[PDB]
Design a protein around this ligand. Structure first.
Ligand SMILES: Cc1cc2nc3c(=O)[nH]c(=O)nc-3n(C[C@H](O)[C@H](O)[C@H](O)COP(=O)(O)OP(=O)(O)OC[C@H]3O[C@@H](n4cnc5c(N)ncnc54)[C@H](O)[C@@H]3O)c2cc1C
Length: 629
């Protein structure tokens, strides 16, 4: 009887197939001849964009140990070439067919296909990805559209990419939405670049809920009155967060757009602009678009007539070329029959860690958990290790399954509380999820085993990327030692991140929010760093058009759009006229000077009490996770 069948092979399945091959576990992969959206994009020459996630969070540990030299954002082309490279390695183990049905019995499943061939396997892993409405827009995208109006009812990474492609042809963009959370994908920390996922120091949640909340939530919740922040200049960007019923911040189910702020875009790409655009580095600064009026926010009930395809805003009845409805995603699951009769109903919250479904035997889901920030790789690498351990170690399988229902209840209580299920329940903070899996598997670090301040930097401030947990022990990957050293030397051992948490231990959330926005350039949505890049933007639009062979006439002027922009930007025209690093810098020198100091022996009695707090980091009081114990 076949031990393992993996259904679907694109990106998510790669690390699981790697571990099954290593333990010489019998497996067969079944995956559709048609492949994925990435194959649609490759075939039509539309791999002309870049990831919204860093190299370190987006490629697997076993590629990073070879290929990491510096932080960067991979291209779509690079992401696809990496899928194809691993597909080539495993192609002989892939049956090209499409699974229509799975009948699940007490200790095996019967797998049915479009060809008619059936398969029996003891363990079945689904790695089939999602159907996304928006994929048609991207794969079938027409660029010879110019001077048209588009209306979006949802703001997401897919909408933000479409918008980046539309604005250069003087398409006007209306967002008729209930607000959105957009975050600079890159931040300058004393003039030195950090991806946003590098600043999250998630294991500080173990110090306290309250402290981590103050550390993370001021750019998401409207907590500062600072008139430089986008959510003060453009309040239609704010969201109803009245659904949140968890002390875990940021909450499971929060989604965010990650985008290039134009100042970082300029820093990376100004010196070879057309070449970088041709590679797929596209400026997607939603905050610059709002600043310049290339995008407008309108209330979610602005008059729209779908029959005449007009939207009416102030006193102009605006013709629109296209309404883009919000991007629903659902797992591509075949029919699953419980005891080979009763349709399984999929619900993220009713699975353990998004991986283990109830009422099914030896079926696992891989790739259906979405990271709040950073790449999918962090999530699917840790899921793969979890699945591999459940499949290959009956002792582990027993330990997790014996109380599966109670684990799932305890997880939902911690992360969702009383909130009713939401379509984005599958979205998790990456650094909580990787750590959660690591503790379930036993490849976690123990904060009490930190000896030096350097060890505390590693435990609390070094990002919880999947490769962090592959340095030693059961799932060690050769070269992770050298990789962690390179990362640490490039980022000063994450001392700046560690110092951030120190600086706010004593503040309330309002003080922390003001303090967070007290910099010359704060991390996220700083509207003071837009006007200075208006000339660079015209250089950019010219370079984009050259790359794409488009002529558009800027000397033709859309007078009715100019009028709608005025109305949309009334709060900005009032708020904007009203427009940390000291401390942080002295914090870093203190910490970098006690790097090799023993923690437990640090003396009693800013500089004095920050030492005591550092000593307490050996015994965090909010460590318990009841879904694991
Ligand atoms: C436009 C776009 C941009 C993205 N940008 C990023 C980014 O910046 N960073 C990032 O980390 N992630 C990003 N992602 C998300 C994620 O990395 C991709 O969606 C990735 O393709 C997910 O891999 P997967 O293996 O889960 O699914 P896929 O890559 O979709 O592979 C699944 C495979 O299973 C096959 N299959 C499905 N159903 C069956 C069946 N019943 N029988 C047999 N075969 C089946 C499919 O044909 C397919 O080949 C992006 C996604 C999209 C669409």
């Amino acid at each position: 009887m076949l031990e393992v069948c993996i259904i679907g092979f694109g990106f998510s399945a790669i690390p699981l197939v790697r571990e099954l091959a290593r333990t010489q576990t019998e497996f067969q992969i079944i995956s559709a001849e048609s492949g994925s959206v990435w194959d649609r994009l490759s075939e039509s020459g539309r791999l002309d964009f870049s990831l919204v996630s860093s190299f370190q969070t987006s490629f697997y540990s076993f590629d990073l140990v070879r290929d990491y030299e510096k932080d960067y954002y991979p291209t779509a082309k690079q992401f696809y070439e990496m899928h194809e490279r691993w597909r080539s390695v495993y192609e002989e183990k892939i049956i090209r067919d499409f699974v229509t049905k799975i009948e699940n019995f007490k200790d095996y499943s019967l797998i049915s296909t479009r060809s008619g061939k059936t398969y029996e396997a003891k363990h079945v892993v689904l790695a089939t990805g999602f159907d996304r409405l928006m994929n048609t827009f991207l794969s079938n995208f027409d660029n010879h559209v110019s001077n048209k109006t588009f209306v979006f009812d949802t703001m997401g990474d897919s909408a933000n990419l479409l918008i980046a492609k539309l604005i250069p042809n003087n398409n006007k963009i209306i967002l008729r939405t209930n607000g959105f959370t957009a975050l600079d994908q890159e931040v300058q920390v004393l003039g030195k670049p950090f991806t946003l996922d590098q600043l999250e120091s998630p294991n500080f949640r173990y110090v306290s809920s309250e402290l981590y909340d103050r550390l993370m939530m001021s750019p998401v919740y409207p907590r500062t009155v600072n008139p430089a922040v986008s959510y003060n200049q453009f309040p239609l960007i704010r969201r109803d967060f009245s659904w949140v019923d968890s002390k875990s911040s940021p909450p499971n189910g929060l989604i965010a757009i990650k985008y290039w702020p134009i100042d970082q875009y300029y820093y990376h790409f100004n010196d070879d602009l057309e070449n970088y655009i041709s590679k797929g580095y596209l400026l997607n600064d939603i905050a610059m678009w709002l600043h310049t009026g290339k995008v407008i926010l309108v209330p979610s009930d602005t008059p729209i007539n779908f029959d005449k395809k007009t939207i009416t805003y102030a006193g102009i009845e605006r013709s629109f070329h296209q309404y883009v409805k919000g991007d629903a995603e659902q797992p591509r699951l075949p029919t699953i029959l419980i005891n080979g009769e009763t349709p399984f109903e999929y619900l993220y919250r009713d699975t353990f860690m998004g991986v283990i479904p109830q009422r099914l035997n030896n079926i696992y889901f891989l790739g259906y958990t979405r990271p709040f920030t950073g790449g999918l790789a962090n999530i699917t690498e840790m899921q793969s290790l979890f699945i591999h351990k459940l499949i290959t170690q009956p002792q582990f399988h027993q330990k997790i399954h014996q109380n599966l229902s109670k684990r799932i209840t305890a997880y939902n209580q911690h992360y969702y509380g009383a909130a009713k299920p939401r379509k984005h329940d599958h979205t998790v903070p990456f650094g909580f999820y990787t750590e959660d899996i690591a503790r379930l598997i036993g490849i976690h670090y123990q904060p009490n085993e930190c000896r030096s301040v350097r060890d505390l930097l590693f435990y609390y401030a070094f990002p919880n990327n999947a490769f962090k947990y592959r340095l030693k022990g059961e799932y060690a990957v050769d070269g992770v030692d050298e990789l962690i050293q390179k990362v640490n030397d490039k980022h000063d051992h994450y001392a700046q991140v560690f110092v951030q948490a120190l600086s706010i231990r004593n503040m309330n959330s309002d003080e922390a929010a003001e303090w967070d926005h007290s910099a010359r350039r704060f991390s996220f949505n700083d509207m003071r760093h837009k006007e200075g890049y208006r000339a660079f933007l015209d250089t950019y639009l010219k370079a984009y058009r050259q790359v794409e062979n488009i002529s558009v006439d800027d000397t033709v002027v859309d007078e009715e759009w100019n009028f709608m922009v005025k109305e949309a930007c009334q709060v900005r025209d009032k708020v904007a006229p009203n427009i940390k690093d000291e401390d942080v810098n002295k914090g870093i020198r203190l910490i970098l000077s006690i790097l090799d100091s023993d923690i437990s022996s640090l003396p009693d009695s800013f500089e004095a009490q920050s030492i005591e707090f550092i000593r307490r980091l050996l015994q965090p009081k909010n460590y318990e996770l009841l879904f694991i114990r």
